[model samples]
Target: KFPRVKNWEVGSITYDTLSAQAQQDGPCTPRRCLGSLVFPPEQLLSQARDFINQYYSSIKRSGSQAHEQRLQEVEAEVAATGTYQLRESELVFGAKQAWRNAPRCVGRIQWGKLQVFDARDCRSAQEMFTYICNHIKYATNRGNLRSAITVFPQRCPGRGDFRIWNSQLVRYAGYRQQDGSVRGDPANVEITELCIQHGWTPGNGRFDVLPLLLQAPDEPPELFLLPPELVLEVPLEHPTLEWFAALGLRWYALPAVSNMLLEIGGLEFPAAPFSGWYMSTEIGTRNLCDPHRYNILEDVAVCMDLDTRTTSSLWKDKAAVEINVAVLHSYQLAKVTIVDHHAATASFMKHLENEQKARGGCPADWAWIVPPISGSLTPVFHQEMVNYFLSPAFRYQPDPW
Candidate 1:
């Protein structure tokens, strides 16, 4: 018999970084090829086109021609890389209008959130999936399911207006043996949830997953703590963190969520979401400390610290630990954020000192900012490179010291 073949992986543009990381773990010997990332936006666009041509056309035979044109544009839009604008969507409980909508449980939640329905509450995943698929289909069809955009010449639908409904996966995949297979989520439901709800996984610890495309090498991540989570701001940074913890709390403690602040060197404080992704916006650059002057990624990291690690209530606040060394990285200049805490980073201090002595000061916090490539434009590129800890193709070696 032939030697057992290694398990093969079939990936999509959607699996970009995850698939690349898996393959880079070891050297590419005669027996293998280092895994790679497919970052060409054009390639993703092409594949998406083929998908719609096949799937959308197959169904177009039955649906209205006008609607088919809408969906064709919708699917392509979802796969395109662009600004992730947070938009409002109303929750209409249950499949069809059969299930009653509870105002307390059913209301407008932001896109990219985990909308869970307890079995005790809404017992059927079947119902949930169908609702999701229907909307996703509508989204694919350039149909806007639920939104508050009201005007005379009502704005036309776009990809953002489109959404995926549940059931479409099985509908597209067809019922097969895999339906009950243990190898994958028999329904492939989990990954879909992951796409919609972002959170820290064990891999998040491997932030250095890539170091090419080329830039800095292995660097320690800096910390920022918040006193309490801002109900409005916290959700934006670490999208899934507090939402998961919330499953464990009661109604009374829910209000305490607002009392949170970010942690920064021995003191927990408050900040805003504009501190992160929106830094490039007018509010951040022009309104905050600087404008078009500081590194956006560095600002995002610092703002995230403020959103995640802090608390709001007095009790949680009393127990809060102060942050000492923090990240302060910008091109041309790099340093840790000076905080009220003492020389609390003595060990880290020694480490940085040794690192500087052995070679020269490393990129350090510069890891967050994408560096300019030799021939490429764009001050930075977030595309995948080598994950040095794994197989990141970068030559930036860390100093032994």
Candidate 2:
């Protein structure tokens, strides 16, 4: 059976036959639909085989001797050792494919352009820190951010996995105040505490960048401070509101998530940190305005002299737009690569069309792909999409410690 998808703006329709290939079931059923819920391994040989088949097919070499021989090599390796390794080319392909298969990412239009850095030879936390620093420097690119991922060693049998304790490579320290207030990004309060407990000298500032917690196999996580030069930050300012700069709000240029597990051909990289440029709304609407994070909406509204006495005045809405505009303007002025929600959603619409012709359907999480603000204003808001599990994939993992 196939699902019929429609785009309200274009009045176009398509049947998603690829949904039949979903390897796992979702939260939805005939009784209830929990499509918004955020939700692995195969018998190694079969997954390896399927992944090899996919790789060969990608290069139009399916059924070739090289393909069959590579398949035999993987099978024999797994038969002897109960696991196998991927060729460099295969690893590169898998990394890109995983990005392409990500359902929650609206930036898959640039999936094929990722720069994959192989750090499979890393053996210690010190080495992991070096690799991460290099990743930050390279991906930051002096504010002209580039999409990249640095993959550490894979998980091994009878060994503890390499892990990054931080949710993202770059996050502000969240100090829990004595008065039950948070002094920084509340989303990172626990991680910030962990860093302090691990001997990091806590900073009292609202925007102090947190240090990295790198854990090598079977070892205690080590704290490593990122060099200030490697971490590029954009100080937010509004083009029209000169007072906005006085708020001293700033954010990192790269959105490198560090705690997600990367799966490829039945092998898992537990410490792969992948980064791309930020979408303006992620900072403006969610990070800065969310009740749990910075929560600057009321302050921003007051600064704008908006009528916040009643919801009818739409003070929050006007303030949110101005904040988003500030994020875009600041990033542009700083020469940092960033996309606004409108352009991002429009690009995603084009990506959907590209995937439809290439893979019969595009796996998408509607709640995520749709921009946080101006939901109905984006084309993706009216587009029906199928969500499914695909490999190689990036998956969220529980925090280390």
Candidate 3:
């Protein structure tokens, strides 16, 4: 047997290692491979054509001369420049379509109404910061969240690219203790350390909003502080258990993922940050209860006086349900928009039907489509889904270090 020579992964490749390695083609490639992760060139072009027709038709230009003109224009531009730019209306349509096409997100019901901020003209990290600030303020909307996406310049051949180094626009800090324990959000430990390496001063708090790490092509990365008021956070509390508030937990209202890349036509935008309201389990189950994150499940179980000494007591299960209920209760008390998994899944089923009627089928990734806390509890778990690549889509990109 060959040695398991594991190459270091920079981003999302760690989650799908074998398949990522499978796509590599080269000599000395069995153990390691050299190539950028991207869609096949021909496949990208074909999706581009499909999206072009969809865009024109969405605006009532189907089978009209204007629709044909746009199709011809995109073809000519791609042939000449190797990539083409989307028109203003086309960009708006494509951005929403990308969210609708996102299989991991259960909040696709509001996809068509997303506010798309076209920041493709951003030439520096500072301007990108400004756009992000605006996005935060607008989307937060005084605790009434509005889904939005801010897109930056596309990746160009032989040129530098811009990217937001932060995984989310709003995220808690993670600190590694001397004894190898983690404080705050352990999931963000690596990026948090990277931020410190770049001259960021971190705070020792459960809800400290981590500073953003922004990178412009061929230049040193820069860090920016998010305005305090722009981020709305809700304190965690349970109606029955008063001790729950003493646990000192809180989470930001917006879960804006900033590191993902957006691909439209055959071009890539490595600096697009998108935001939507949170689902209760995302915070309660994954962020707080997950072993890598806060790992507070046992602590909560002890407070509930459950027999945590053994797995036979179902302590973890009971504590997890209470925590998720608390998260939903807290957000509702604070008037921040948040959804429970049951409602979100039911809405996703409706979304599936709508998408099926509109476009022959809906693409879904089963692993992500099912909520982490309750896999079999949701109807989506029983539904068979076909996942495929589509242009004008969002994807995880390698960190632009």
Strongest candidate by lDDT: 2
Residue 308, candidate 2: C-alpha displacement in angstroms? 0.6
Question: How well is each residue in 253-308 modelled by candidate 2, as lDDT tens digits?
Answer: 99999989999988989899999999999999999999999999999999999999
Q: Write the per-residue lDDT of candidate 1 for residues 1-401, one digit (tens) a residue.
A: 11121112222111112232232133345586543322202333343333334333334443556446744454445546321111122111111111111111111112112222121121123332333233223322221112211100101124111111221121101111445422212232333333323331212210111110100113222111111221111111122333322222101001011111211111111210000111121222221213222213333434335542443433222212110011111100221111121122222234333433542321222122221112122211212222222111111211122
lDDT (0 to 1) per candidate: 0.22, 0.91, 0.80
Which is the leading candidate under TM-score? 2
Stretches off by above 4 angstroms in model 1 are: 1-30, 33-44, 50-67, 71-401
Name model 2 segments beyond 4 Å from true. Answer: 39-42
Candidate 3 clashes between residue pairs 3 or more apart in a chain or in different chains: none
The clash count of every prediction, one per candidate, is: 45, 0, 0
lDDT of 2 at 380: 97
For candidate 3, write residues 1-401 as lDDT tens digits.
Answer: 21122212211111221222122122324575322223325455575687787787787778988888888877887778777788998778888988877756777878889899999888888888899999999999999999899989888778888888888888788888889887788888888998899888878876678888888777788989888888899999998999999998898899898988887766788888888899999999989998878999999998999998899888999999999999999999999999999989889978876776676556566667789888778877766664554556787777765
TM match of model 1 to true structure: 0.16
TM-score of each: 0.16, 0.98, 0.86
RMSD to the true structure for each prediction, in A, is 26.0, 1.2, 8.4
RMSD of 3: 8.4
Alpha carbon deviation, residue 146, candidate 2 (Å) = 1.0
